A paper describes a structure:
Wild-type [name] is a tetrameric protein with four identical subunits. Each [name] subunit contains eight antiparallel strands that form a β-barrel structure.
A second approach is to create a mobile 8-amino-acid-loop (8-aa-loop) mutein in which loop is engineered to have a completely different sequence but retains the same length as the original loop in wild-type [name]. To avoid this complication, the [name] mutation was introduced to two constructs (8-aa-loop mutein and ΔW120 mutein) to create 8-aa-loop-[name] mutein and ΔW120-[name] mutein, respectively. To assess the conformation of the 8-aa-loop-[name] mutein, the protein was crystallized in the presence of biotin and its structure was solved using X-ray crystallography. Using data extending to 2.0 Å resolution, the structure clearly shows that the mutein crystallizes as a tetramer with a single subunit in the asymmetric unit. Biotin is bound in a manner indistinguishable from that of wild-type [name], but there is very little electron density for loop (residues 114–121) and its neighboring residue 113. In this case, the loss of order in loop of 8-aa-loop-[name] mutein allows for a much larger rearrangement of the A/B dimer relative to the C/D dimer. When the A/B dimer of the mutein is superimposed onto the A/B dimer of wild-type [name], the C/D dimer is rotated by 11° relative to the position of the C/D dimer in wild-type [name]. An interesting feature also clearly seen in the crystal structure of the 8-aa-loop-[name] mutein is that a disulfide bond is formed between the Cys-127 residues of adjacent subunits at the A/B and C/D dimer interfaces.
Numbering used by the authors:
A (entry chain A), B (entry chain A), C (entry chain A), D (entry chain A): 12 to 112, 122 to 143
């Protein structure tokens, strides 16, 4: 049920856009558009998720990587996100990330709805 | 020159084995075998690297993900590594990692030679 | 102006309570009460902050440590928080933390007002 | 036995010097001299450790903070270290750290002996 839940479009607290297809055998493929930093437009992402998550109602483990080179620019950097997908009406991906240029750390919360402009200003 | 340098087999300070092919447009694909934790044999990895790194002699940014499910076992977890490839006679990948089951953090140093059994015992 | 701004009581997104006095020469002393984990009541904290922060309107760097032993219990663990104090009407301390038992990572946002019960349920 | 083991002088893999007294009730006080970054001479540190660690032979949890202002300079930054003290003939403090200016992450291994000049060059 993780494949159906994960596949689609996600927005983090900054308004960045995470577009992902979850493959049957645990592949993540898609694009990432960061609302911040030395980035513009979409970047290729790839990653992995647990395609047979535990039937005890907990989260699905996943992670992905973006190297910050596209046709617009090259930041000479890469970010990995590591976290858990939880489904339901308020579906979320809770992540910690590492950005290497020298490794910055932080956390991103992704949901299926764009956060309000006021919340984007706050976070 | 990053593609030629990255592609191949890497060992971390724990004796884990990282087998990777760097694709021309920035893809990382391969297998990971962890010497520790709830893991055995090889796991699929995918990731990204900067395929046009800066010509100022610094490192190449990269990252990859392993979800810890294979035909032997499923740990219901995923690790991302984020770091820099530096080439030369003592080529290295310096990484920080995030393991999500609840996110553990650490650091792995990968080289082209297996560390000595005595160093593996130490680290 | 950092001393006046920092000294007082702070609540994170989980409803944990951070009570701190900022000393003139950069000392942080006080108590921490975690709303979660293997903890109850208040624990001694100590830390440091930049007592002469830059006059360019940016944040004040700080960090503190709690070892999770008090008169109620001992979790045999310790957390450090590292982050920035920003003042004003919506004063905040943005932190990343490391909990060592084996090091967990996360992020806590502290403000001068308790988050709503509904937000505490969410975060 | 943690108090006796911790108190003293420690060197990390970079040759930085960590001088600490462990207090009876779990206080850490001392100085830190970083071999790298925007730092020179010694900086005040304070932190906490588990003063009644588990009798099952495992590590002692601890953490400390340095704000990077002294009489020589002010970097407008602060680092926290979080980790475990293990005693014996090859006594060590294994740490992860967070440096906030915007939070960098890494790991430091401290021992009672200075690493060789050749190892300092490597790490
Ligand atoms: O500045 C760079 O080097 C590239 C852009 C990085 C943007 C980071 S990645 C982590 C965080 N989450 C986001 O959606 N954007 C920032
Ligand atoms: O225990 C698990 O959940 C799966 C195995 C995780 C092994 C970790 S990943 C980070 C670190 N580096 C390694 O080579 N192995 C450990
Ligand atoms: O479980 C333990 O070992 C002690 C309690 C730890 C609580 C953590 S510390 C980081 C995070 N922020 C909080 O306010 N509480 C949790
Ligand atoms: O550059 C600064 O802002 C102050 C110096 C920071 C030095 C860091 S702290 C973590 C790491 N471990 C060390 O011994 N030094 C570096
Ligand atoms: Cl797949
Ligand atoms: Cl490619
Ligand atoms: Cl003071
Ligand atoms: Cl004490």
């Amino acid at each position: 049920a993780a494949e159906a839940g994960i596949t689609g479009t996600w927005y983090n607290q900054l308004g960045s856009t995470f577009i992902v297809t979850a493959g049957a055998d645990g592949a993540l493929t898609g694009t990432y558009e960061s609302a911040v930093g030395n980035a513009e437009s979409r970047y290729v992402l790839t990653g992995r998720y647990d395609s047979a998550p535990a039937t005890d109602g907990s989260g699905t483990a996943l992670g992905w990587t973006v190297a910050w080179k596209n046709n617009y620019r090259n930041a000479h950097s890469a970010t990995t996100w590591s976290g858990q997908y939880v489904g339901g009406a308020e579906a979320r991906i809770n992540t910690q990330w590492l950005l290497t240029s020298s490794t910055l750390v932080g956390c991103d919360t992704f949901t299926k709805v764009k956060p309000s402009a006021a919340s984007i200003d706050a976070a």
